[PDB]
């Protein structure tokens, strides 16, 4: 069966004090390496918060080696490409530096704040589009507000331009599977909860244009949510931290939550996505190696 395989990991960005990683980040690096070795991966998606707590200063920042390259260094992961987007902490520093780092590290691919990826499932005519968004420039930086919510964008032109781009791209996308990814959640039951900006501006487009799933991090846990139209919400924000909060449980429409794992003494985890001509599958994997939940999502008509 033709297949495209990828890991989606969020909020993995270590720490700025020595040794520049956490035990959770290392456990996820090892667990991801084991998953790649045993099941395979064509690429890894980062769902943002790549360098805690204030990003990187420029493209030569030692954190690229300390928190990224040296951490994800097990043999099975050498040469697996990453496709990256930014979170709020990245935007407290220099995101242009993370984009420029694409020219330094072969496996790091981050061409602009938001961009389109297209894949053909090998030995099939089935196609996949992934739209990588910058939810910080769209909605604001949550760290700019005492509320730790993205109350408004810093720059109106950047936000309006990205929204227009999303709309145009989603209206034109002909692919068999269409995924959208961004740092902040549409829906989440946890410490930050739903992002009002995305519920208002992005979700109507995901629905109208029959997107398969929206992938995100930002809340430091694992969740699968699904609305009554079958649109999936893959929340994978557990590469470095585990927050057991259910603070926003009642702010998500009843029944949307299908799976949640946030145990405070867990090492975290990630999502593993498999796309075939038959369906898309998502498996949530704890950093201890345990498979926690698996679900499938359909092809677009
Ligand atoms: C951000 O990083 C880029 C790439 O290294 C650099 O050219 C630019 O000067 C940096 N910006 C600031 C404000 O440091
Ligand atoms: Fe985070
Ligand atoms: Fe975040
Ligand atoms: Na390995
Ligand atoms: O986050």
Rounded to the nearest whole angstrom, what is the distance from the C-alpha of residue 176 to the centroid of ligand 4?
32
CB atoms within 10 A of CB 258: 13
Ligand 1 pocket test: pick from 54, 59, 64 the residue with the most ligand atoms within 8 Å of its Cβ. 59
Q: Rounded to the nearest whole angstrom, what is the distance from the C-alpha of residue 93 to the centroid of ligand 1?
A: 9
Tokens of 144: 């700019």
Under 8 Å between Cβ of 238 and 269:
yes
Q: Half-sphere exposure of residue 87, counting CA atoms within 13 Å on the CB side?
A: 28
CB-based contacts of 65, cutoff 8 Å, min separation 6? none
Q: Find out whether the beta carbon of 213 lies less than 6 Å from any atom of ligand 1.
A: no
Using CB atoms within 10 A of its CB, is residue 162 exposed (0-12), middle (13-18) or buried (19+)?
buried
How many Cβ atoms are within 10 Å of 233's Cβ, its own excluded? 23
In short, whether 94's Cβ falls inside 6 Å of ligand 1 is yes
For 118-178, the DSSP string reads EEE-TTSS-EEEEEE--HHHHH--GGGSTTSS--S-S-HHHHHHHHHHHHHHHHH---SEE
Q: Count how many residues are written for the chain.
A: 301
Return the SS3 of 36: helix
Ligand nearest to the CA of 98: 1
Tokens for 299, please give them: 């092809």
Buried b (16+ CB within 10 A) or exposed e, 199-232: eebbbebbeebebbbbbbbbbbbbbbbbbeeebb
Which method, experimentally, gave rise to this model?
X-ray
The atom of ligand 1 lying closest to the CA of 60 is 5
Residue identifier of the C-alpha nearest atom 1 of ligand 5: 218
CA 16 to mean position of chain CA atoms: 21
Residues by chain with Cβ below 5 Å of ion ligand 3: 49, 87-88, 218
The answer on whether 61 is annotated among ligand-binding residues is no
Q: Which residues form the pocket of ligand 5, taking CB atoms under 6 Å from any ligand atom?
A: 11, 49, 87, 218, 237
Q: Would you say 220 is a known binding-site residue?
A: yes
Interatomic CA distance for residues 72 and 70, integer angstroms? 6
Six-digit token pair at 135? 């939810």
Buried b (16+ CB within 10 A) or exposed e, 12-45: bbbbbeeebbbebbbbbbbbbbebbeeeebbbbb
Other CB atoms within 10 A of residue 154 CB:
14
Instruction: Note whether 123 and 74 are within 8 A (CB).
Output: no
Dihedral angle of Cα 9, 15, 20, 22, to the nearest 10 degrees: -60
Torsion of CA 51, 57, 61, 62, to 10 degrees: -50
CB-CB contact of 232 with 297 (8 Å): yes
How large is the greatest C-alpha to C-alpha distance in the chain, in angstroms?
A: 51
Q: If you measure from the C-alpha of residue 1 to the centroid of ligand 5, how many angstroms do you get, rounded to a whole number?
A: 36
**CB of residue 137 inside a 6 A radius of ligand 1:** no
Nominal resolution (angstroms): 1.2
Q: Are 217 and 10 in contact (CB under 8 A)?
A: yes
Domains, the chain, ordered by start:
1-301 (3.60.21.10)
């Amino acid at each position: 069966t033709p297949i495209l395989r990828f890991v989606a990991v969020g909020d993995w960005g270590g720490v700025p004090n020595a040794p520049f990683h956490t035990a959770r980040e290392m456990a996820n690096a090892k667990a991801i390496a084991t998953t790649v070795k045993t099941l395979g991966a064509d690429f890894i998606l980062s769902l943002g918060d790549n360098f805690y707590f204030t990003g990187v200063h420029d493209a030569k920042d030692k954190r690229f080696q300390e928190t990224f390259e040296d951490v994800f260094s097990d043999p099975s992961l050498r040469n697996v490409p990453w496709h990256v987007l930014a979170g709020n902490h990245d935007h407290l520093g220099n995101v242009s530096a993370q984009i420029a780092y694409s020219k330094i590290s072969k496996r790091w691919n981050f061409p602009s704040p938001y961009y389109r990826l297209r894949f053909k499932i090998p030995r099939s005519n089935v196609s996949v589009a992934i739209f990588m968004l910058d939810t910080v420039t769209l909605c604001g930086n949550s760290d700019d507000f005492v509320s730790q919510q993205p109350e408004r964008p810093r720059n109106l032109a950047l936000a309006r331009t990205q929204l227009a781009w999303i709309k145009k791209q989603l209206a034109a996308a002909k692919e068999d599977y269409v995924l959208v990814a961004g740092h902040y959640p549409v829906w989440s039951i946890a410490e930050h909860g739903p992002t009002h900006c995305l519920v208002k501006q992005l979700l109507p487009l995901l629905t109208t244009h029959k997107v398969t799933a929206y992938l995100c991090g930002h809340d430091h846990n694992l969740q699968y949510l699904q609305d009554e139209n079958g649109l999936g919400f893959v929340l994978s924000g557990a590469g470095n931290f585990m927050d057991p909060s259910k603070k926003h449980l009642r702010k998500v429409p009843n029944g949307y939550l299908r799976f949640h794992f946030g145990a405070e003494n867990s090492l975290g985890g990630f999502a593993y996505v498999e796309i075939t001509p038959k369906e898309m599958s998502v498996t949530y994997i704890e950093a201890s190696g345990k498979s926690l939940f698996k679900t499938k999502l359909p092809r677009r008509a």
